[PDB]
Ligand binder design. Structure first.
Ligand code: QUE
Length: 237
């Protein structure tokens, strides 16, 4: 992710077929002539999309120009959570299924995976960062405390940010409860709160494996609900 001079970011297209599929998704959702109510509502939960972008001298080098969802924050605390029971898509080969499940074999049970976090600490005026191996090490026994860490600043557990996150996720859940046209695999939620009350951003990202469907995205719904349940239990701390 590159931070373009505008309060925007540039996300470089992943290699094919993943990057092209993500481009296609953003193009479908943000089509100027789109009046599908489902897709118009979905726009609220994505970064705003400004189209494909390439450097002036490098039309080969493809990016998505996207809203910087952290722009309104001073000291943003950011967590990326992959959502769903399966991180492989409906056309994955046996090898690919195994590759994806082996990255985190608890995906079916938990329904989400923390990809990373960056937490501002007041006491030290510095960031603690957790990488991909952090969330991949979390089990049913440790997922609550693992998620809790995101909301620990210098002095307190940020239950305000926890409650706001639940409230924002519930709107996304409601969108999923009311559509049967898209299924999302290996997609994520980006959580942002202010680390420097109740002010949170939750946006859906990572759309290289979104497929047309005729069913409720049940794995995504499972994950959102379990994530809501974990966050809710954290409010009892
Ligand atoms: O707006 C975005 C953003 O700010 C970040 C970001 C910033 C700082 C971090 O430390 C981090 O992990 C992610 O990622 C993104 C990823 C997307 O796919 C789309 C986006 O719009 C953003």
């Amino acid at each position: 992710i590159l931070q373009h001079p505008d309060g925007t970011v540039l996300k470089q297209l992943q290699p094919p077929p993943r990057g092209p599929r993500e481009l296609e998704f953003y193009n479908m959702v943000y089509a100027a002539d789109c009046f599908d109510g489902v897709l118009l509502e979905l726009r609220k939960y994505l970064p705003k999309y400004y189209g494909i972008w390439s450097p002036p001298t490098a039309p080969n080098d493809l990016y998505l120009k996207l809203e910087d969802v952290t722009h309104k924050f001073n000291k943003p605390c950011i967590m990326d959570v992959k959502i769903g029971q399966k991180s492989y898509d409906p056309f994955a080969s046996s090898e690919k299924i195994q590759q994806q499940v082996s990255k985190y074999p608890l995906m079916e049970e938990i329904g989400f995976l923390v990809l990373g976090m960056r937490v501002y600490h007041v006491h030290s005026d510095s960031y603690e960062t957790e990488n991909q191996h952090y969330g991949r090490s979390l089990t049913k026994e440790t997922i609550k405390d693992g998620v809790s860490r995101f909301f620990h600043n210098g002095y307190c557990l940020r239950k305000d940010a926890v409650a706001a996150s639940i409230q924002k996720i519930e709107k996304i859940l409601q969108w999923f409860e009311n559509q049967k046209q898209l299924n999302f695999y290996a997609s994520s939620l980006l959580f942002v709160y202010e680390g420097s009350g109740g002010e949170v951003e939750v946006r859906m990202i990572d759309f290289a494996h979104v497929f047309p469907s005729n069913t409720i995205d049940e794995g995504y719904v499972y994950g959102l609900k379990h994530l809501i349940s974990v966050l809710r239990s954290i409010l009892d701390n």
